[PDB]
Amino acid sequence: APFVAPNVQGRVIKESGYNTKTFKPAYVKPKHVIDPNMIIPRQPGEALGTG
Amino acid sequence: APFVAPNVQGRVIKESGYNTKTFKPAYVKPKHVIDPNMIIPRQPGEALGTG
Known part of the structure; x- marks a missing residue:
């Protein structure tokens, strides 16, 4: 004093x-296409020879 | 002796x-003026739009 x-x-x-102070959130948007090419070949938990 | x-x-x-030993004290005078320019604008804990 x-x-x-x-x-x-x-x-x-x-x-x-x-x-x-003020803020705004960002924006996230991923995706995937699903062909027949990503389906038809064999996945690992499937027996060899047959399916 | x-x-x-x-x-x-x-x-x-x-x-x-x-x-x-002698002493004398010192003197202290602070003050504030209050306008209407200090009363009116918004104190921070008040909601937006309508005060």
């Missing part, structure tokens, strides 16, 4: 305010 | 004094 000789009035002290 | 042969008179010893 400021020192002030007791004859004079005194002194006004300033102040301050504040700020704001 | 001084050593004195028991015929002669004796010895006299000096003494000590005082000191002083």
Whole structure:
């Protein structure tokens, strides 16, 4: 606090305010196509020879 | 204490004094003015749109 000789009035002290922040989410969208080519060859848990 | 042969008179010893300290306090006068320019705009914990 400021020192002030007791004859004079005194002194006004300033102040301050504040700020704001805002954000927006990004957007993610993957996909897959499913051909017959990704279906027809053999998967590993299938017996050899036949299917 | 001084050593004195028991015929002669004796010895006299000096003494000590005082000191002083004085003080005076200092004077402190802070203040604020309040406008309508400080009352009106939005204090932060208030909802958007309608205050």
